[PDB]
């Protein structure tokens, strides 16, 4: 990749640990943000409206069915695709090779170019919202499927994400 | 759930037995309607334009990628999610844990909260339209997959739907 | 089918061998074009803007969630559904019975009516763009799945597409 | 069969979807009605007393232990035997080769002459009457047994019946 | 069931332990009698002509092919169906889901409503009449089949019948 | 248990998510703290010296080889034992039935009385400290062993702990 290659950090429509995910992206030396349409609606509700995101990142929005921003992968601008947080919906689509959103398109094209992907499946354990949410067998099956993809690291916690980003930086010597 | 909890009755883009499905929803003491985008285009063609639906129900439309109406599940307003009629497309998405429409989002969030779902797979037998439509192996495989989900009742006829709604009311003492 | 029945030639959001695919469609005596939303954005970038397409074909665009153009299958206007080129995304959706685009809707309704489908999976071998793209295991698994569908011919090259169209014409006596 | 061969439409003692079954028989170009003794008692209770039936059909009644009307099969007057609705009792008797009623006699003699039979097992899913009726394992086992008979099509819904009649007409070119 | 729900006590054409069976029915707080046609001929020969039965019970006779008395099950009048004595013929018909008599019709409709059935198979052991009667393999196979039915208790002696009735009363709190 | 029964919240010598664990314990209506000797040395280094702990909780310290505080379990004062955070060392000792610290003694005596235990194994995923820590096979084997104990819930994240505490409160009606 280019010397100034970046992280392609994709965000999906989950408020769960959304704030902490963006905080992690901020610690990265160079990352651009890639939003699904649902992320664009959800993020403002959790403190990350587009004007705020744009103060800290270049932001690419899902305003093309084709996923026009993905052409930048072909020129070596991104050495890594991250999805954090990754909704069950996005984990599902990734696991089955569906790419009709910007984050799922970024993930599939990265894999076809053997560019590493780190996926933070944020909905894989019982959680409180009080109301208890529990992942169904399909959520667990999809996480297992996607974790078997080549060039893919699936992580299930913030700590584990932080460690995978750290491993990545270490490999790239950044 | 709350004492005045309702049925969340989702409608997808099928005209098949659509009229009879809405007739069943009308017999229910309290139900709100949740439409996919395709349902919104199809329903008028079969006698159920939005103005007519709104005379009988509160109607929620799929005008958010995030599926904003689904937050109402968290407060115990819906004791049951119904999808009737359910297109093969929606049965597929449900079966694989994809939730990028309002009905498939309602179904997945219900399941994560252990709220029962009743799914009327209306395209599972040979039918006439004359032209004969026959479900393919994938339609049959997807129906079998979804019927194995926890908290899910898959029904293949109007009679069977009516019976599942009846079982539900009996459990809730309504 | 009707005596003047046509090919329903669907196009998806791939520039790969797009030009040669349209060239093949032009050689056909009678074919209409059916576009996904992503095809509509991609085609202009490769020399096939809508005004140009409309000089040679009737063109149906994906401007309904329901897929309104598909009703024409019921009246015997199309004796064959073709998808060429077919993105990995469309092959995936076809393979799992998802139909939320015009081409995937055309393919599923055709199959339910036992109308033959020919699918040109254009992303199944290593290719150069220089950058090398390689299909992942999921792309290969999805191609294998879809090739097992009834009434379906999956082809992996232009030559093979041309031969399948030729076999079809021979059967229809055109 | 003769050029003016008909459907032999048998009716058994079920009120379930009885009205809709007779409505389907009315749409047929040429059909005669064959009643069990229990059908003769049940039909009036659901709007189809003999005087009404006789306005629309030739009606044969079960007033012989031998089943005298069945001799008409031998002369090619009936190209198809239909049982709709078919009680669990009749499905049972058919499945085990018992023929001591007019409809079960018509079905067995048809099969021995390789004349196709279409059987509408109307009691195979949970239904409401409110009271819920659920088919027992024996009802389900008997439906599975009878569906394996040569020259037999077992259908489990009105839609499916309509489609089987349609397939039949198409074969006969009617 | 209703507070004043009764036993539906069915009688078949067996003189074997017939007297003792009626004696048991008399001990029950509330039971109605349901006769097969053969019971109606046999009972007088063993001391229980209709006038005598009618002094002690409401008596329903098999004077409809449809089995008109069975509609009373739908309104919760009977909390239990009993067949005592049950001929091998009735055990056979029950075991195979045939219902062309009033007792076999009562038993099948009860089961479809999940109303418990108690069946006294009175011909399952060697007995004297002197002449020795021995049940054949088919009688034993049919008893084994019927005993596996849901909601069914098969008993092979008076003592065992008395105990099953006692268990039933205990459950109902009568 | 007594009406005013409490949580027995045990703390071990881990600074990892220690702060957040104590924050969770603070949200509980009634909980006492039980410290290992290593917790007593570690806690001050992460902001929770004994004087601070004692402002918010009754605190029991590991100042007996016998584990004298554990006698309070016998009188129904604690309805639940929690270990959070639980070091790999404590998970190991628990998994093998060793109880030579106050938290491992509390956990074993609880289990012998069928009092539920919730164990937060805080060292089960790759984490950063930068230095990466990765659990060895023995840590993973021990977590699997302990999760199979009767009356035990093993959780691997804060979210999951919060949910298990919530499930517990719901059961106890607190």
From TrEMBL, chains A, B, C, D, E, F:
Keyword Nucleotide-binding tagged: yes
Keyword terms, alphabetized: Flavoprotein, FMN, Nucleotide-binding
Keyword Flavoprotein: yes
Single Gene Ontology MF annotation: nucleotide binding
Native organism: Paraburkholderia xenovorans (strain LB400)
Ligand binding (FMN 1): 13-16, 36, 88-90, 99, 105
Organism superkingdom: Bacteria
Domain Flavoprotein, chain residue ranges per copy: 6-129
One Pfam short name: Flavoprotein
Protein name from the UniProt record: Dihydromethanopterin reductase (AfpA)
Record-listed FMN 2 binding positions: 109, 112
Database matches in SUPFAM superfamilies: Homo-oligomeric flavin-containing Cys decarboxylases, HFCD (SSF52507)
UniProt cross-references to InterPro entries, sorted A to Z: Flavin_trans-like, Flavoprotein
